[PDB]
Design an enzyme around this catalytic site. Structure first.
Site, PDB file in Angstrom:
ATOM      1  N   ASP A  35       0.778  -1.221   0.000  1.00  0.00           N
ATOM      2  CA  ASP A  35       0.000   0.000   0.000  1.00  0.00           C
ATOM      3  C   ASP A  35       0.817   1.283   0.000  1.00  0.00           C
ATOM      4  O   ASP A  35       1.249   1.729   1.067  1.00  0.00           O
ATOM      5  CB  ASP A  35      -0.951  -0.032   1.208  1.00  0.00           C
ATOM      6  CG  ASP A  35      -1.934   1.123   1.272  1.00  0.00           C
ATOM      7  OD1 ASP A  35      -2.015   1.888   0.298  1.00  0.00           O
ATOM      8  OD2 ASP A  35      -2.593   1.276   2.305  1.00  0.00           O
ATOM      9  N   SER A 199      -1.145  15.741 -11.861  1.00  0.00           N
ATOM     10  CA  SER A 199      -1.369  15.341 -13.250  1.00  0.00           C
ATOM     11  C   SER A 199      -1.644  16.600 -14.085  1.00  0.00           C
ATOM     12  O   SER A 199      -2.312  17.523 -13.626  1.00  0.00           O
ATOM     13  CB  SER A 199      -2.561  14.385 -13.351  1.00  0.00           C
ATOM     14  OG  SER A 199      -2.841  14.066 -14.706  1.00  0.00           O
TER      15      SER A 199
END
Ligand code: EMR
Length: 330
Positions: A35, A199
């Site tokens: 994770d 992004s």
């Protein structure tokens, strides 16, 4: 040194990925969920409440000659999905695909929430976010990656998740045969303890690319792609019959549809998530309505580039002095 381990989807939908981890002496192999969105290495154990264990493999610290109880240390974690676990702490030898860390904090669960109990294939988690999120009290512990970093040939780990197929987690090296083109590196903020980046935008199918900053985290521990409501509405508006269902808790679409792809920007580079990656099957057994792989982050507070996005790319988690994230098509 280096490490290399195969990661496999737990089910036919790629709901999560498990990677075998060797703990203790002699080795006790447990399949953990790697994770990058959390920082605790925790396992189901001989101390977990019996009724809360259903099919998982347990770590028995008493059978490990290298296990040492970490005096007075406890841990307790609550995840974004409402799931939780807690317990005591041991230090033990942990190995991932030939890479060994001695004295790693292994958090033994005394309690797990129902969500963990019902996932028989997941024996615990292996946190790969920054050690500032580690929940061990009163003395915070370091992640496996942090403990191995100095010894690694290069201070990196890579995630190469498969779509309906096995993949790989590598530590200490970049496998240049595992991707096409070049790796594009982008800035990371560690202020929230996550592999948080920005992004450069998106495209839905063959549509025009929208240049827009989307701050989010690279999180192998989250199954889906969580993005702003505007972006997710633009995506599902291309799927005939798709709608946001309050009863299901997200966007659903006719199972007979062929989904358009989703592209996300990494600097000037583009990662294309094929449409089939966004299909999460029937909302309930035998239903003709399917659950979407791209969902709104409006209720979360953060955008999450989960498995849906990461499995489309070869991802470099660069733990250099100033951490960065690298993405390449594959
Ligand atoms: N137990 C419900 C949540 N889990 C999470 C991981 O994949 C399988 C389903």
């Amino acid at each position: 040194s280096t490490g290399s381990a195969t990661t496999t989807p737990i089910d036919s939908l790629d709901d999560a990925y498990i990677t075998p981890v060797q703990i203790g002496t002699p080795a006790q192999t447990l399949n953990l969920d790697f994770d990058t969105g959390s920082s605790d290495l925790w396992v189901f154990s001989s101390e977990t409440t019996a009724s809360e264990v259903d099919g998982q493999t347990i770590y028995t610290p008493s059978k490990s000659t290298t296990a040492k109880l970490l005096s007075g240390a406890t841990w307790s974690i609550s995840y974004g999905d409402g799931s939780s676990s807690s317990g005591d702490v041991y230090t033990d030898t942990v190995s991932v695909g030939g890479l060994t860390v001695t004295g790693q904090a292994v958090e033994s669960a005394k309690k797990v929430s129902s969500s963990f109990t019902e996932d028989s294939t997941i024996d615990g988690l292996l946190g790969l976010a920054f050690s500032t999120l580690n929940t061990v009290s009163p003395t915070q512990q370091k992640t496996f990656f942090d403990n191995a970093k100095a010894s690694l040939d290069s201070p990196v780990f890579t995630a190469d998740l498969g779509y309906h197929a096995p993949g790989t987690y590598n530590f200490g090296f970049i496998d240049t045969t595992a991707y096409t083109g070049s790796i594009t590196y982008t800035a990371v903020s560690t202020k929230q303890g996550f592999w948080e980046w920005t992004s450069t935008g998106y495209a839905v199918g063959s549509g025009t690319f929208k240049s827009t900053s989307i701050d989010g985290i690279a999180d192998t521990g989250t199954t889906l792609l969580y993005l702003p409501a505007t972006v997710v509405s633009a995506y599902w508006a291309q799927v005939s019959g798709a709608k946001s269902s309050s009863s299901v808790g997200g966007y659903v679409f006719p199972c007979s549809a062929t989904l358009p792809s989703f592209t996300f920007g990494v600097g000037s580079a583009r990662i294309v998530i094929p449409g089939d990656y966004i299909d999460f099957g029937p909302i309930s057994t035998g239903s003709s309505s399917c659950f979407g792989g791209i969902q709104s982050s409006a209720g979360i507070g953060i955008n999450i580039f989960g498995d849906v996005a990461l499995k489309a790319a070869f991802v470099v988690f660069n733990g250099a002095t100033t951490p960065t994230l690298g993405f390449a098509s594959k």
